[PDB]
Every structure is written in structure tokens, then in C-alpha cells.
Nucleic acid binder design. Sequence first.
RNA 1: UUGUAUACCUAUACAUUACCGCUAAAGUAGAUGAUUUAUAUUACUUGUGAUAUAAAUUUUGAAACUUUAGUGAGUAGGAAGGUACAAUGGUAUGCGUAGAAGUGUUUGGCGUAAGCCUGCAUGGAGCUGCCAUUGGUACAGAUCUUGGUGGAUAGUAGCAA
RNA 2: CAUCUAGUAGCUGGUUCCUUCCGAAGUUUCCCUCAGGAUAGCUGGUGCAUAUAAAUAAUCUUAUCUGGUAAAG
RNA 3: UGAUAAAGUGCUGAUAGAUUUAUAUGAUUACAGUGCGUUAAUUUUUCGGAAUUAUAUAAUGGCAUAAUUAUCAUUGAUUUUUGUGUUUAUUAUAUGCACUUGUAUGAUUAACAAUGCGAAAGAUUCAGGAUACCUUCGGGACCCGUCUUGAAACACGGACCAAGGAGUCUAACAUAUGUGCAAGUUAUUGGGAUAUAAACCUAAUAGCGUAAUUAACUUGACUAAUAAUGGGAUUAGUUUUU
RNA 4: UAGAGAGUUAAACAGUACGUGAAACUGCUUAGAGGUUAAGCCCGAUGAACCUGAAUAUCCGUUAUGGAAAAUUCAUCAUUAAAAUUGUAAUAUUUAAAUAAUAUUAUGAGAAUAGUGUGCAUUUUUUCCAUAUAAGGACAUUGUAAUCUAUUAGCAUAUAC
Lengths: 113, 187, 147, 149, 132, 134
Amino acid sequence: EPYITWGYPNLKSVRELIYKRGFVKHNRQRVPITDNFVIERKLRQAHQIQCVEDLVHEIFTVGPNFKYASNFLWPFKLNTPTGGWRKKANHYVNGGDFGNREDQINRLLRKMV
Amino acid sequence: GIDINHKYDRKVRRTEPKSQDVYLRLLVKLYRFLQRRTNKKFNRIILKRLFMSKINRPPLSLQRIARFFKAANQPESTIVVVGTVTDDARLLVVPKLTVCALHVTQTARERILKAGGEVLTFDQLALRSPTGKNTLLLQGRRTARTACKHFGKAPGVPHSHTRPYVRSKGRKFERARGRRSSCGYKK
Amino acid sequence: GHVGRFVIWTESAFARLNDLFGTWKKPSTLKKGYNLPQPKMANTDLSRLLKSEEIRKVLRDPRKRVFRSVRRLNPLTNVRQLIKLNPYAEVLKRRAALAAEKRTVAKVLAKAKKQNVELAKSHFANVATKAAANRAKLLAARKKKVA
Amino acid sequence: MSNIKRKKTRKLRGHVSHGHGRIGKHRKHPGGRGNAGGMHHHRINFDKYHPGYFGKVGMRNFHLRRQHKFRPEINLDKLWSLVGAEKFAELEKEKSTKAPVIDLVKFGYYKLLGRGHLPARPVIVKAKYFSKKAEDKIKKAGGVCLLSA
Amino acid sequence: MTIRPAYRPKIVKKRTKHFIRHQSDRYAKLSHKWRKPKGIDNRVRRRFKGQYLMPNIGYGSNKRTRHMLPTGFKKFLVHNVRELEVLLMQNRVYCGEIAHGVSSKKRKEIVERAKQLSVRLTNPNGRLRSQE
Amino acid sequence: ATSSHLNWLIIRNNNAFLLKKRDVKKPFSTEPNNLASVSSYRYSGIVHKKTLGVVPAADKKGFTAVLKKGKYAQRPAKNTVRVDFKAGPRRSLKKLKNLLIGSKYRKDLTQAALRRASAVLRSQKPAPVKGKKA
RNA sequence: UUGUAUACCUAUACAUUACCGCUAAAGUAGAUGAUUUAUAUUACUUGUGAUAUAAAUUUUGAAACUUUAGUGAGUAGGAAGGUACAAUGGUAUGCGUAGAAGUGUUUGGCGUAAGCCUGCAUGGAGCUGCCAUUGGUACAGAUCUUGGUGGAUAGUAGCAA
RNA sequence: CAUCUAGUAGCUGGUUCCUUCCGAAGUUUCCCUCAGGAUAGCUGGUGCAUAUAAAUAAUCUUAUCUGGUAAAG
RNA sequence: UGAUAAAGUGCUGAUAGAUUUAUAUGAUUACAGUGCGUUAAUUUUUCGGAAUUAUAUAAUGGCAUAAUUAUCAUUGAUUUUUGUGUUUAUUAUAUGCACUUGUAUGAUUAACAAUGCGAAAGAUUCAGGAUACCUUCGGGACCCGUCUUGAAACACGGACCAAGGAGUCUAACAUAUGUGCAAGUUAUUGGGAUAUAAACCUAAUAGCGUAAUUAACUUGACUAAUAAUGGGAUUAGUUUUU
RNA sequence: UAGAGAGUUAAACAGUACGUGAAACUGCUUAGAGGUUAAGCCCGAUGAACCUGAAUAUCCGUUAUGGAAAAUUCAUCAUUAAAAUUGUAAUAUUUAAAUAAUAUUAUGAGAAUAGUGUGCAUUUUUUCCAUAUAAGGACAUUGUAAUCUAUUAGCAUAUAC
């Protein structure tokens, strides 16, 4: 908990992180997106994911191939917020940062995406 | 900051022989072409075993090659030894065999040839079987080395049986306290 | 330690190389027990071997296009990378921009009821043309009920 | 004759300690000299790795003579390689024309042991000493062992 | 001038200065040429601020323009006239520099033969004797 | 012993013509039939008979007198003239670089020889061109 | 001082990008009329294919080129590659009284770096690149060794029984 | 005085080129052992066996067993 | 009224950067756009103009039920697989031929314009340069080697220079890698043959290995002429083989 | 003693610290500066000095024209004499049957080399120069304008709750 913040993403935050920041893992290498063939060539024979909005679907509405839809991604190497942080070593509910922000993870992803 | 890249991040295989023999590296030139362009794991075993040392390519007998060749439904295959093929004088009748080896021994050459079958090199094999069809891929027993019996010694356990390093043989040479229950203990 | 010295034989020094070193069938006469060393490669021409139609008929393909293929474009300030990754972005991006162009006309009409000048081309081409292209959808209710 | 270019004296130039630490760096003999002291501070090193060091298991042969326990031995395992190369199978026509009179004291061998898996042909072996199983598998194929020096 | 390389690149040098051995200013027995400091407390080696920098390999030159002279070319030592003719086919990528111990008598053939083959030399008009 | 791929590995790091030159990692070799002096594999001395050598002149400063391929019909044990067969185009620049791309109906070393010939003709061009410089 | 508010400033951290390395993965080796590409004749499908005639690129130190990703603290210590010195065996149809080794230097450079090449000045007879094999092989320290030198100091040291 | 004698030293001191990569230990047992070893651990090197699941292995959830410290008395 | 959320919502003004030797050994690939294109109505500013409606097929919504599946609470509401019309909306496919200074240039940075001519020998213009310095200024900045838990230390050494100066040789073993031969192997004590302390040839031995165990005396590794340890398990490969 | 001038010498920077002549350490010259951790140092600039590198022909084209020269196998071809290549055939050799490879012969098509000639340029072939389109275009250094990545700030066209 004290090394982490989390919360509950919008649909807009699912899209903007996969559109702008979404990279993907191709035989242990990190491959950007740039087209639908990077998603389709690895998740269409087994799973049924060919588009980007496929990958946005079974992550947002947590579908039966969520295990693959989110381990396909690389970890989202986010920027730093604009305006920065609040304290980083108090809880969100104390005076702000770590732990569950819970709907205010959206406002913070606008700064980082 | 990120985590955390000790080992064996750098893998410790071989990617080349350690060997300045030109006839051996011409076979590496074939078999990188053969492995890359026919993706058979036959040709990747031949390539990876062509890199190896003198240990890890142990010899193989003329009697162990005649006796792996009682593989059923295989009357016409080739014996592939990335290694040497030694003569066995405990084998009284050599069968009719097709042998591909790096070194076939000289007296193993005549007993294969007077039978008579084939000694081939690994480029007479690349033409006959570019994908390793009709092949018996055989190696020698690695840990038949004497050096392997000395790995490794620390008495207390009834597994041990692991061969101490000792200059001569006989009593007076490491046979009393720890070997013998009337001298200290048995190990 | 280097091979290739220019060597001149005589003929009775060339007759004796089959006695000193052996032959490829028999052993030597003068080096008792010596056989000639066997190579690891008999054919040894990698140029003939790589042609070679025993080898060449089993190989895969050189499949040839090389994939340099890098830059990640941003599909939130691009549109030609957003309409490539997600078609149906185009559909609603048009469907809202066409409705946004229709909200404009209802505003500049309802404002200009205090001026109501034209009806021609200058500040009312993007207004009064589409205000009278609702006669072009008078047809769609009238002439399309013949089916 | 050895390299030094590959030795590590040539890579430790010039780092201060030469492989050996700041702390307990190379001194002359900090455990003693040689195999001492095997029962005290090198006890563990001598058992393990060398058990049976330190004691006495006995019978003192003042003047051993190794020309007494000489006895070069030979299994049944080989035994047919001694007789020449084509008679191996020139007798398996089938035609039992031949038990080969083998004399191992002319081949340098003195005992015939029996590890074997021997073929079904008769032989006439002449060793000095016998294994019991040697003479039980050669009699099982119609052979002898002429007990000769 | 003479035959400039093969649509030349713009050379970016990571730093132009060189590397100076620590405390080599204090002593006239220390050359400036870089020795790595091994000492247990050494503030250069432990990379404290304000000190003289150490050569790591982030300083290494672009691989395109490594060993390129300012004039575009890599360098090729020339020792006699037949060695210059090796540059008949490399004059879009190489200079030529006459070896310091080539005499004035023989440097005259080399600067002659390198206008024909169009080799750009790095030291023309050296060891002349610009007289007859 | 017969192959060129064997022959090269016996020479690829020490021969009389290898020129290691201190920094740009391996471009040079000085054997008389190279066409692009590099030590590559078969831009090389002996290839056993596709050793193509474009040279001047013989009559300097005439033309590109090409030492050609020496091919099969002597052994390739070499000359007192026996193995080498030496034909030399002249008259132009455009009508002898076409009668050297035409003497080589087979294409691999051609364009190293069409650049070594086009640079020998340039190398004796200053006897007509680049005049008195007033 | 206590409780808050916005707005800024600030790392070698984080993001993107350029470049170095290291790591890990992948590609490429028909040269004989081999592969393409642009035209120019015919079988024909409408169109493509084939023969023919019109220009090039490619003998990738197969230890080489090409492609993509990540990554980077370090004493003791280990390991790879690289660089200085001297030799021996080969080698460069090497260099040199038309000036070798050495030294000097705001000559110009190259190399991440050890170091290297170069001009000029002095110098006067020898020396260097490559492949191998080497060795009495690289110095700042050791109250190191030998030699030379500086301050202190031209002296309030002093040369006064 | 010269030699044996370059006597020995678990002790002090010094130990000579660059870059790249990986990266410790002050603990175990035993020793006339406590300024020191040998030993195991930690380190590196070198491989090897398995690359156009249902192999397993490591912090949580579940199931179960264990525990006598905080608290309680 | 405000707050939260969403829609390339849209617009504006900036900053920094722009690999790319498109073959010193693989198509400039496909997409998309612009230029001549049977019509016929319906409008439009009236200009080479411009808009609309009319063509099939495939969907998808909104609506009206009829089924069906299954659940917060059930007066009902939500939901899965459907069905068909009622219907009213929206997307997709049906753009061939030739041409052109319209995307990924398959890490794109590419254009218009100004300055300045690389003079026969030698100027000049623009940009750059801790060359060894000097000048100027702001930030940084303790003295190294060492033993140490910790050194700038009021710990020790070092005034300065040049030359010299410290992990070797050997015996024995081990592992590893190289190489040769391989039930072997190694001539190296000698002897020959000569060409020169080398190189060459070679007898008979011997070492190590191929057989061990036991204090010693004894004894000594199964009927594989055909079972790699016999058997089992885990098993890469093999015209295997279905 | 010596200094200065001569003189010998290839040279006395070779005259008995007699080859070379380094560093430490400084006398003199020359050039800036000086109360600013004691100096020295690092980074980024700076004044002065010095130094280094840098256009090879068009837009929306390695142009139409027009001129000039010369090979005299080429000129397009035809003809001849050779020298090899490639691909057939055959014989002797290895590896005895084919297979391969090596010589020694022959064969064909296509090229290339030197010789002659509707022709020497018969309108072509080689080899040079002024003449159009949008410019001195190319080069470097700038300014501009647009694109793409990463990023900063600012406005407000509507919907939902």
C-alpha cells in the first residue's frame, strides 16, 4: 500500500492509456502498437482479440481473457503528473497520495497521460 | 531505477567453437545455413554439438554403434556421431552400417568398410539427409570419465562413494581413520 | 608457423612421397604404422554445397521484407492514426462534427433575427444555404414513398 | 613458454592489492606449511576429502617384491581378438574345424578371468591361473584350459 | 576541394576536451593521461561533484563518424608509392597521410601520384624543400 | 584442399597482402587481382579462376588492360604463360566499359571492375584534362 | 507559531528523443547468362506469364553485414576485450645521411580511454606495421634505492675562548 | 668480523595500463583457537540439458494443522 | 445557479527535437486522395459552380410484439440465445483504366528566400575550436596513498625530479579448454640415419590406462555368440510408424 | 684563466658538463593580470591571439536545338585472323560400373581482340560548347513557413448526471 496508488478507471482512461501509452509484448520484446496487426498477430488464434477496441473491451468490462489482455501489455511507463503530487507518504485519505484514490485515479491519469 | 539484472541475463552457452580447425568451422558454415534454412532440430543439434569440447563429445564404441542399430523398422539409417567412433575388439562380427562421425578411428574404419558400409563426413551427410531423415543420432556417455567419479567427497552420507584424490594404492594410503570402524569410525 | 612455402621437388623426390606418407588405401612403408590423417570434410567446397539441389530443395524461404518499421504516432492528436487503429472513430467523429456544424447554423440564424440581412454568400453561405437545403430533404419524405 | 600476457599479473597492474584484499592480504604462511596441522586447525579438510588419513592398518612387509603378485589377467570378453582377424568368422561357416590353441603366456597374460559373454565355439586356452567361471564357460562350449606354465 | 566524401555527415562530438589524470596538476611527475584512481577514499573515483570527470563509454563517438577527420575522411597511412595505389578505390572514404619517415626525395612521387588517383592527402607540402 | 572457402580461412588473417591499418577495422589488402582492395572473401588472390584484375595499361597512359579470370583450361597451376589470359579494351570511356561488361556475360565481379576501369581511365585523364591553369 | 488555500522553484528520479555500450532475440548468403527494376515482342483473359533486345547494385575481414528490444551505481574480488615495452619466428619486392632512434613544441588531428598518427625545430645511423610465440613487460607512494635539485637563505644561522 | 642467510614473521608497509560486465563478506562449526586458519555460506568464471503446457518455481486467497507472546486472570 | 463526467469537442498561441550512406547485399510497399466518366428529377449562388433524391446486398440501432434464458425485487424491473414483420434511423461493400510537386517516406523533415564565388601561387564569408595558456565572470570544489565501523583529519607516509623498483621459476597434482591418436597411448633413457645442440627414423622396455577387492591368505565381475546398467520412469531425435 | 674578433669543420648547440642533451629548478626576454578557497582545480561561457572545415549546375529535367573535332578492329553491318569462357561429345587418368574431377582433343551458339572495305562523319559512333522551363538553384550559415514526436499555456460548441 504505501508504495502504490490505485483507483477505478473510466472508459476514457482505458482508451487514453492504450492509445497514447499502450505498448505490447512480442516474444519478450516491447513493441509499440502503431497498427492492429501487433495485437491481432498474438491474440486472435487463441483469444478473440484483433483490434485495439477488443483489448479495450476485455480490460474495461473484465472479460474471460482479461488475464491475457493485460499481460499482453507492457507496464504503462507513465510520465509524472503536471502539478505533481500531494505528499507521497501519507494515505490518500490522510492528506493525499498512496492507496485507493478510487475515482480520482482518473484525474491523475490525465496528468500522466 | 528498475529491477534487477544479475544473471544469467548473460547466457553462458557457446555460440562458436573454441576451435581454430578450419575443417570444423566449414561445417559450422554449412550447419548455420542448414539450421536457419531448414528449421529441423536435427540440424540444430548437429550445430550446437559441433561447438562442443572434447568432454561433452565423448567417444562411442564400434559395439555400441552396432547395438543401437538394433532399432526396429530402421534397416537403412545412418549412425550420426558428432564425436568419435572407436573400435571394439569385444565385437566379433561388425554389421553393415552407415556411420557419420568427425573422427572415425582407423581400425574402426576398416571393420566398417570390410563389412561393408559407409563412413561419411558431415558434408556427405548434409547432401544425403539435409533434414536428418534415416538417422540414428547417438552420443557417448558423458560421465564415463574417471574425473566424474571424484565429484564430490564429504563422508557422512550413505550416498557418497565418491573417490578421493590419492597418490598411490595400498594400505598406508588413506585407509585407516574414517575408513575403518576400528580406527575412529566408519565414514 | 605459416603454410605455403614454394617447394621445388625433383622426380625421384616425388616418387618417394607414396612411401614416406602412406596412400589413401594402404599405410606407409617408411613411417611404420602411419596412416594419412583423415579430414573432417571430404568435399569441402561450401560453394558447391550451398547450391546444390539436394540441400536447396528442402530449405524454407528467404521471406524478404525487412521490417525497419518504428515510429509510434499519438492517436489523440493524430486522426489518421486513430482512424487506422479504430475505424468507428471516424463514424462518430463525423457524426458529432456534422451535428456541431448544424448547431452553428441554428445559432447564427437565431441571433440574426435582429439584423436578417442575407441569404447570399458572405456571413450566411455557411448559414442560409443549409437553411434552404431542408427543401432537399422535402424530396426524401415525398418522392421516396413510391416503394 | 607459458604465456604471461594471459596471466593475471598483467591485469592487476595496477590495482593496489593484486587480488588479495585490503583486509587480510597476502602474508607468508597463515595456516602453516604443508600438511600441518592435519589433526588440529585443518581437521575438517582432512576428513572430509581425505578420510583414512592418520592411522595404521597393518601387516608390515619388510621388502615387498612386486614380482610376486604380478599376474596379468584377461577376461573371456576379449580372448578372440587374440587369435587373428579373419578366423573370427571364417570358422562360423558352420564348420567346427578349429579350436584355437591359445597360449596366454606367449601373449603376456597369466590369468584368465571370466567377464565374458563368450561365443559358442571351442577354444584351447593355456593360462597359468584359472578363474572358476572362466573354466565353467569354456567347458560349456567344448573347450579346455590346459593348466600350463 | 579534392574528392570530398560521399555526401558527408555532420560530425557531433561528445566532448572536445580530453581527460586529465587526478592530481596531475599538482605534480610534475604525473602526466595528465588518464589513470583510473584506485584509492579507497578518492573523491574522483567516487565521483563527487566539482571534480575531474572520468571516461565512461557514454562518451563514445557515433559509429558512423568515428575516426572521421574534420575533412570527412578516415585516415590511411601511406609509406610508399605502391601503398598509395590501394587508395585508387577508396578515395571517397579515405585520406592518405605520408609516414613521417618518408624522405623528401620519395614524398614527391607520392604527392604527384595522389593528384592522378585523386587521393586527398592530409599532410601535403611537408618535408619540402620547396626548391630545385 | 581444393576449395576456396578452405583457402580463405587459411589466409583470412595472415597473408603477404593483408594490410591492417590501425582503426577502421578491416578494409585493406594489396594483392594484384582484387578490384576493391579489402580482404572480403573472394575479392582476393587465388579464387581458383574468377580472379578478375582490371589494371593499366600496358602502354601508359592508354587504356584498361584487363587480366581476366584465368579460367579452367589450365590447371590452375600457374603460368610461364599458361594460366592467364589478359585482354585489354581501349578507345573511349563509354565504348570500352560496355565491351568489358560484355566480355563478362556472367555477373558478379563486374561492377567492381566497372569502377576500377572507370577510375583507371580517370587516372590518366589529367594528361588530356585539367590544363595549364592560367 | 497553528490550521489551510492557490501559483511557482528545484535532482543524476520519471517521460519522450538523439548517441555509446552491454544484454537478449531475429534475418541474409543458387553470382553460370543468380536476383531484381524500368522499358521494348508474343501466347492471349479483360490481364498476367514466357522468349528477346535497352542501366545499374551486390565476391557483406560467414570473426561480416542487417533488424528489433531492453538496459547502465560499485570497494574486496572475478572475468572479457583493448592499449604501452623488449624480443624471437615469419611477413610487408616496408622506411632511412634527400635525415633513423631520441628529445623539444600554441602544427593539425584521431581515439570513451590507455594511447596513436602528423608538421616543424634539434639530432646524426638505424628503425617500424602485420601473423605467431613470448618475457627481467607498464610505477606516485614502500621513513623505497641511486643520483640530481628547490625553498629555507646570500640571510636575526653563523665565522665572538 | 665474515658465513650459514635472501634464517623465520598468524605482524606493519608497499605492490606499476585503460575500458566493459557481474558483484561480496564480517556469519556457522571446529582448532593452545581470540591480530590467524580450515569449514560451510555469500561471489565469479565456465558450461551443459531443456529458441522461424497439464514445465514448473516464488509473495496473496482457500482448506487444514501448529504456537503460549501481547492482552486477560 | 455550482460541482463531477464524457464527445480529435473544436480553436488559438508557443518550446525542444527530426535516425534516416531508399540495397558499400532485397521491391518506395500497400492505403487513401485529386484529374475525362451513361443519367433523370429536385433545388441552390447564378462562375469554371454547388447541394440533394432516385441502385442492390449486408448489417446495426430506435420502435412494436411474440418466444427463450436467468436473476436485485417482483404492481414489476433487469438480462442471454432468438424469431419475424412493424418500422423508422445509421454504417459497410459494389471506385475500373491512365496520370499527378497529396500518408507510412514504412525512428519521414523537408521546402521558399537572404548572405557568401572553394583566386593560376596566395584573400574573403560563415560556423566551430580550454590547442598550452593568458583575460573576464558565475556555480562547483578539503589531500592524496593507507589501515579502518568511520580520514580533510590534531592517524602514518609523501619537499621536488629522473632512472631502478615488487605475484616469478620449478616439482607435483586438480579442474577447465585446445590439439593429436584412441584399447590404447606416450620415440625423448638410448641407438640409428645424416644437413647440425635442431629435424628425421627406430628396437626392446617401462609409465599410465585397459580389473578389482582384501589386514592378509585366497579369490576375481551371470548362461548379451543377440539386451549400454538389466528392469522402470523422465525422455531431444529418427525414410521411423499409424 | 679569459672575453671579443677571426680561423678549422659538413657542423663548434662538436672546443674537453667535447655524441644526443630530458625533468626538477630558475636568470633574461615577451604577452596579459594582480586585497577576493593560499594557490591549483571542475563546468559553462568570455576578450585577445592562433587555428580548423565548407557550393562542381536547374523548375513542376545528368534540355531541345546549333556547332566543333577525331577512330579509319569499332562506325550499324559484312569479312577475316587469333585468344580464352560457357555448354555438348569423345578418349586416356584417378575413384574399378555409372559419378565426379584432371589433362588431351574435337563441336556448336553468343560474345570480346586485332586487321580491311555501301561508308570513312551515308543521316550514325566516340568527344567538347553557347543557346528553354521555374533559377545562379548545388553548398554551408541564417530567417521563414508547414509537417510529425515528446511537451507548455490559453479559450469556450454542446450533452449527461
